[PDB]
Amino acid sequence: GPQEYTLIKLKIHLIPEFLGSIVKGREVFVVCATLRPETMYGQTNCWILPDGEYDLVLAFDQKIFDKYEDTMKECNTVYICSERSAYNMAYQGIVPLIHGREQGVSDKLLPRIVSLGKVYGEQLIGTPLSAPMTPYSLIFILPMFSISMEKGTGIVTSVPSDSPDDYAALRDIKTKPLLREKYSIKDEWILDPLEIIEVPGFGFMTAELLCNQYKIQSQNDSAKLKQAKEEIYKKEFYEGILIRGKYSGMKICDAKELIRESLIKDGYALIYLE
Amino acid sequence: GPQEYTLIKLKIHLIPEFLGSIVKGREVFVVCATLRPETMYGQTNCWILPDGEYDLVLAFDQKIFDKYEDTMKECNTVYICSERSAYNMAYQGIVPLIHGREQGVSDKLLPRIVSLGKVYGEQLIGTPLSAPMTPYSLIFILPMFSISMEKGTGIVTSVPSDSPDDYAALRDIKTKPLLREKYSIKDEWILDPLEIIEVPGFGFMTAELLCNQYKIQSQNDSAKLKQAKEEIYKKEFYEGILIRGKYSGMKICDAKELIRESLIKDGYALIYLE
Ligand SMILES: CC[C@H](C)[C@H](N)C(=O)N[C@@H]1[C@H](O)[C@@H](CO)O[C@H]1n1cnc2c(N)ncnc21
Ligand SMILES: CC[C@H](C)[C@H](N)C(=O)N[C@@H]1[C@H](O)[C@@H](CO)O[C@H]1n1cnc2c(N)ncnc21
């Protein structure tokens, strides 16, 4: 049974040289899968799995190609994502496929994505990103250890006001200088949570309130975080009121698909199934 | 690593009542996955797994819908195929998805195919089909026991002149009246193999010649059939000359993609990945 996500495109604002030599002038986005496009107003940072190994996937700019060279000339965009998600994107028309030459002979056509190279999540910690809707001009890639490489793209945007997981993981960074030292996390990469949604019995900073209610102490308390995640998801969909954006004042249930449609129209997001 | 197939659409020429009550006036195709679109000239019958359980999938006539009713009004076509392949088709835009109502609540969107019902392969034995390119006006569904429900659509068209598997399975039908009796196979459903490809050291009926060379005695001789299959595939791609069609006289390697493009343009075939 597949699930529908919104893939959010976070533009790399300054491409580091270790990527620039491989992507050669192309726009590069880190792409994240979310069920909650309506929370983009509250993004504070991006999350990656430090030991996750990600692809640099050639993508269509805002039919299966016969030649690598033609695909390389026609596509000026790269998506950083798990290879797994890249194939799903390719089936869905989001990135090109080519008739691969890497095995067998010409008697069979073997469709393959075009991956320029690999990157470890750790190498991206600290990269500045332009993200949609958030008031921050730049947000930064930080480590999260609970990320599954088997889900979405393996890259996750952070809205700590309204995700218990994001709140716990960011608090882990804020309170452990041995964590910040290990990955050289600068202070200026750690941005304050933003009030974006009112939950009429809880206030405007609901993820923090629920982490306390469930007595969650770290981003590893999986069973507890699972209950918190599920409660905040249902409660906010049916009762949460947006206090930001075009649909400020409206319930999430009434605004969510309009927000999502706008992100898609504006080129910040895509529909993604897996 | 995905493979590229051509899905061949075989139109049901007379829809039996047990299907007609479910599909209600819609065109119905049995859809088959093949690597060899150039052999459509030699189709003699269609194969199904008697105990395979197939879906009746609503399909686009020659974006995810919110309502079942709208999808039902907009789609006048049904594809018989495995559910597994139907999902792959849906990801690739070949059949519609809807936002399902079958579980959970409105706070999540769960894309689902629209399956009108199930059919067992056995119930379809004897159904007359209009198939592309073959000189036969109608060909008929027959049982093949080696079919994998995990591959393609679980439905396979038959070209016994140039598929060792098809030759063995049809010969099993021709020589076992206990097989024909069990499934009530009429004589007039068993059509003669057609000469379609010359292999310059082998002649015009190469699959039969190879089954003898490998001493294959039934459609179950999997290891032997695997070697035969692989030899005929490579040999015919590089050395086989078509004696039928627009590209008669040309080598398969030079004609195959033009034949395939034509089937697609004419609405007889689609590109399918899995
Ligand atoms: C306020 C929500 C904020 C932006 C929140 N941060 C969010 O977008 N969460 C993602 C998604 O909505 C949720 C349920 O599918 O899992 C997260 N997710 C997506 N890919 C993931 C992965 N690879 N590993 C762990 N969680 C993942
Ligand atoms: C002359 C070729 C004639 C039409 C030949 N009959 C052909 O089209 N063969 C299919 C395909 O080309 C081959 C390799 O993928 O497996 C058959 N195939 C496809 N789906 C299958 C399934 N579910 N189970 C077993 N074999 C399958």
Author numbering:
A (entry chain A), B (entry chain A): 254 to 315, 330 to 541
Paper quotes:
AARSs play an essential role in protein synthesis by charging tRNAs with their cognate amino acids. Similar to other LeuRSs, the C. muris LeuRS contains a predicted editing domain exhibiting highly conserved motifs that are important for the hydrolysis of tRNALeu mischarged with noncognate amino acids, such as isoleucine or norvaline, while excluding cognate Leu-tRNALeu. The structures show the typical seven-β-strand and three-α-helix fold of the LeuRS connective polypeptide domain (CP1), plus archaeon/eukaryote-specific insertions, denoted I1ae, I2ae, I3ae, and I4ae.
